[PDB]
Every structure is written in structure tokens, then in C-alpha cells.
Structure 1
Amino acid sequence: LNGGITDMLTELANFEKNVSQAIHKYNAYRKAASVIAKYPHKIKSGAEAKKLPGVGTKIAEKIDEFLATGKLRKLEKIRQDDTSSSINFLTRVSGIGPSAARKFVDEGIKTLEDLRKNEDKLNHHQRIGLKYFGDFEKRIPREEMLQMQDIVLNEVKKVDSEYIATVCGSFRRGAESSGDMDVLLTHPSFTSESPKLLHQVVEQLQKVHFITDTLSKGETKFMGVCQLPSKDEKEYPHRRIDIRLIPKDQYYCGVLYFTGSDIFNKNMRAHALEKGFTINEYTIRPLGVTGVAGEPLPVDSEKDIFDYIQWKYREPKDRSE
């Protein structure tokens, strides 16, 4: 409904992040963009938008200019700037951030071709990102995601039937499509007060050719790439997968957070504060009278957390906000 405006702002967001290296202005512009994307009227003036939490004066002027002229001078100029449009563009390769993109572009390396003639100046992560540049900007239909889930749960269980594994993120909320697969993994032998538990699982998903590459991997977090096996039909795009190993006592705080949504997590956490509780990704802790969080409270399911702060347990179907 204000796509013209929310695109304008989303473009501005990226340049701040990618060219100006001003992460907070990026987030500001995104916040503005979100709040407007939900406003159910066609905006008529910058003054009208300025009412929304997150649209201040400078953005209200931009909207004014945009509504009157159909463009923004600053955006027009920057879009056409050889250096800046190039720095902004190379950041689309996973693993190249604004700092690596600046350096390339400084040494003349501007395009995906340029990257392709310079593999040796790229780290491992960045090469996988180049390799799969296209696939990484595709969404994943739920149908494939269910096929992916099948594989992960089968293979996890087959390594050791006592592992618990939950596919979280936009998939667990019932979205028709996902941008990646986030897997949360625990095992009764692993608690906070507690050692190749993640490795054996990556091992097995590699063994059956589900996991095809590795961005990064430690004792707790796996970041890599995976692909469904090819059915006649054309093969499946490579997909981003993360696998996290969480201690059992923090596992459900984990599930809940990595289930989201963003906005839902904000509310729930705010609410929980006003009920005298502190929730992070790991633990819910009781705020005392001066405001000192004491020991973490025992959690054994999701619903537990909801009880604690007296909220009606939420089916993830309804965790939009």
C-alpha cells in the first residue's frame, strides 16, 4: 500500500548498512519501513507518517519529496554511483559484509564476475556464498521444508534415539515458505551444569549427502548448506541450514526464541518484565525487588514459560505478534 515508500526506505536501509557502515541508521530505516508496511491507509503526507513510532522528521521530509516527485534525489544519485552501488551489491554474497565489500571495490573488484576471477582473495565462507549466490536468495516452499524435516529427524534419531530435535523458525509457525532451516538440538546427557554431540549429527547428514558444505562449525553451532536429493525432474536449490546444540535446561527457552516471530518475542519479553520476570534465549529468571535477577527457573516444556508469566499458552500458528 505504500510499497513505493517502504522500498524507498528499504533501499536507504541497505546503503546505511552496506556503504555508510551505520548499523543503527539501517535499523532505523527498517523500523520505519515495518511500521509503515502495517499502516492500513495510503499515506498522503510526511506529517501523517510522522505519527508512527519510528518515523521522525528526516523520514517525513523524504516521504514529502517522494510523494511530490515520485523519487528521492539522494537515492537517485547513490543508485547511479559506481562505487556505492557496487559496495552495496557485493554484500549480497553471504560472508562478504560491508567491510569486505569496501576492500574489494577499492581494489577494483566490483562484480560477481570479478569475484569469480579472484577466488584466492575469498575466504571459505565467501566462496560458498559465491558458489550459491542465486540459491541463497530463493525462498523455500513448505513442501520442501517438510521433506527436509523428514530427513533431519530421521538422521538425528538414527545417530542416537535420545536426541531431541525441533525445526523452529518460520517453519514451526506454519509459514507457506521459509528463508532457511533452523534446527535446535539437545540430548539428555547435555545440561548447563554439565561432547561430540553436534559433530556426530553433522557427520551423519553429511554421510547421506544432505549437508553439502560448511560455513562454520564448533561444539554448539553449525552453519552450513544442504540440498534435497534429486527426484527426471530438475535438482533442488542449495539451502541454508543451521543446527544448534542447546543444554536441556535451556532447550525450551531456545525453542521458543528461535520460533519467534521477531515482534512476538518483543511483546512476550516486555510482558514478562512487567510480571517481574526476565527472559532471554537461555533462561527465564525472577526479577527481585531492587531489580536483581536470581537463579534461572526450571523449564520442561514451552508452556512452562507461559505459566510462569501467566500467559495463555500459544500455538506457534498464532505467534505472529
Structure 2
Amino acid sequence: PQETLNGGITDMLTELANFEKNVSQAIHKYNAYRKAASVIAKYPHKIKSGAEAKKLPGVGTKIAEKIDEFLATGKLRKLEKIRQDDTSSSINFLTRVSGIGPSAARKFVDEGIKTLEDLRKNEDKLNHHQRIGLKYFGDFEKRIPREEMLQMQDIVLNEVKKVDSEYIATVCGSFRRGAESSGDMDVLLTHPSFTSESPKLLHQVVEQLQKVHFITDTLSKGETKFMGVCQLPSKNDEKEYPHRRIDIRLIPKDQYYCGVLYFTGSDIFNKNMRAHALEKGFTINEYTIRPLGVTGVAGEPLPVDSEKDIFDYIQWKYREPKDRSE
């Protein structure tokens, strides 16, 4: 429900996760805090003690104990000193720039660099990806309105076809799940001339999308995966639409739907499916669905021509993309 119920607690947890991830470089601690913060979100009751929250999956002794200290004092000793930390705050912030992870953030903060302004003055100490992340700092933190997504979709699809009518292109993520807003645009690309058996295939797409002035920057590009920046055309005299993150993967036709399924998520939904496929005699990854032997041994890939085949194999009513949150 609404934040107020356990916002103070979930906020603390989230703040702690960011600290562990950006500062401590302890990714598993980050996830442990995040998982607990989200499970405490679902909870329909005002948590009155740590022991209460402990009754949940993902909440152990340490978090239960911080919840006890939080309820009593309204603060968190640890988070307090962390907010004072002249370094922890700065390292946390810099990682908000795409291309700057825990390592670079720390190096910058040690060289005295700790604000966007500092970054602008020292563009020379940043690689190409980081320069772009700095350039579109604000634009990258904005949500993309579904209405805008559709508009972008029509552009990609249209252009993809303009190059070769046999190109299959699907847009996934929260978009393909119907959501009103999306963080970025993920596009899965395939072509009949590309399978797990058989360079200008992905390239001529990125190339074309550059010609119609959609894709504006490249973070990374190779023969199978592309990550860059796109933008919708300006409606005369009106604000130029913000720049957006676009990913374009070239997946083999024989593992395209497993791809399509995996990248449509949500990840929590996939887990409730991966773990279900596991106790029914099947394994689902990003590329293929495979049959297991008695001794947990895998086996050759099984023919998948549609996102539906995956469900039939593990006997699970084809869930709808519209209601596949979990």
C-alpha cells in the first residue's frame, strides 16, 4: 500500500542497499537489503518490531535488529554517520552517472571530483560511455511515457523493415508488459539468415536508424549487442523530446523466443517459472529450454517457435504479457 506505513523502514533499507552496492562494493548485501525492502513493501501492517518483520522471507536477524533500533529512535546510527561521510555521499551520487560504477566513483572522489560540475570540468578523465552518461544525466533518470514508446516502436519496426522485410523485431520489458512508463527501450532483433549454427546484420540496422536521426549516440556496439541513445523527432517550436536509452540485441532465430520471454520478465515472474520448470523436468535460461536427466544433467535444446511452446513444455497456462508481473 501507500509509503507511510513502512516507508521509514523501506527507505532506510534502500539507503542501506545503495551504500553496500556503491560504497562497499558488496553486491549480495545490496540485493539482500533490496529484497527485504520490497517484501516489507507488500506487508499490509504497520511493522511494530523487528521480530515481527523477521517472520518474513528475506528479513533476517540484522535487518530485524535495525528495524528495532529504527522504531525506537526514529533513526539509524549507521546511516547517520554514512550521511555525514564526506565521501560516502559523493561516491553514491557519482554512480548515478551511467558508465560510472563503484570503482570509478571511488577514484573520482579520491581525485577530488565529486559533483556533476566537477565531471564537466574533467571530461578528460572519463571514457566515452561516461561522457554520454554525463551529457544525458537528467534525461536518463526520466521515465519514458508508454505513448512515447509506441511512437519509438513504429520508428524502429518501420526502419527495420526498410532494410529487410524478413527481420523480426520485438520490443520487450515493462513496455511489452503494457506498463504506462518504461525505463528504456529493449529491442530483440532476429533474421531467418541467423541461427545458432550459421556482422552487417546488426550494423545495417543501427546504421539506418542513425540515418533517420533516431539513434544519436553509441555506448557500445558489436555484432550481437548494441546499447546507445535515441530520441523522437521534435514537434516544431516545442521542447525537443528527451534522449533515451535503447538496446538492440541480435538473437538467433532458434533461440529468439526464449530471448523474448526472458527479456519480457518480470525477473520475479521468470523465477516463479524457472523454479517451476525445475520441478517439472525442464531448465529455462536466456537462450534455450532444455530437458533434465535423473542426475540433473541437461540435454540438447528443444525446438521453440513461439513464446507459447515454453509454457506447454513445462505445462503452465500461457501467461499473458499483460499480466506477467509475477
Shift of 1:18: 0.6
Unmatched 5+ stretches in structure 2: none
Distance across 1 between alignment mates of 2:209 and 2:124 = 29
Deviation digits for residues 158-211 of structure 1 (CA, Å, limit 9, x no counterpart): 111100000000000000100000000000000001131110100011111100
1:77 CA displacement: 1.3
Deviations 1:23-82 (A, max 9, x none): 111111011111111112111111110011111111011111111222111111101211
**1:259-317 deviation line (CA, Å, top 9, x unaligned):** 00010000000000111001100000000122211100000000011011111111101
Aligned to 2:295: 290
User: Which among 192, 196, 200 is matched to residue 196 of structure 1?
Assistant: 200
1:218-276 Cα distance to aligned partner (Å, 9 max, x none):
00000001111111321111100000000001000000000000100000000001110
**Take 2:94 and 2:44, find their aligned partners in 1: how far apart are those partners?**
35
For residue 83 of structure 1, the aligned residue among 80, 84, 87 is 87
State the alpha-carbon separation in 2 of the partners of residues 79 and 24 from structure 1: 22
What is aligned with 2:284? 279
Distance in 2, matches of 1:45 and 1:197, equals 58
Please state how far the C-alpha of 1:6 moved relative to its aligned partner.
1.0
Tell me, in whole angstroms, the C-alpha distance in 2 between the residues paired with 1:237 and 1:6: 31
Q: Distance in 2 between matches of 1:315 and 1:157?
A: 27
Equivalences, count:
321
Identity %: 100
Partner of 1:224: 228
Q: Residue 238 of structure 1 is aligned with which of 234, 239, 243?
A: 243
Report the secondary structure of 2:189's partner residue.
strand
**Structure 1 residue matching 2:293: 3-state secondary structure:** coil
Length-normalised TM-score, structure 2? 0.97
Q: 1:3, CA displacement in angstroms?
A: 1.3
Task: Give the CA RMSD over aligned residues.
Answer: 0.7
Stretch deviating more after TM superposition (68-77 or 47-56): 68-77
Q: Which runs of 4+ in 1 moved over 2 A?
A: none
Q: Note the residue ranges of structure 1 that are not aligned, 5 or more in a row.
A: none
1:1-321 alignment, distance < 5 Å: 1-231=5-235, 232-321=237-326
CA distance in 2, matches of 1:149, 1:5: 39
Q: Which one is further off, 254-263 or 30-39?
A: 30-39
SS class of match (1:82): coil
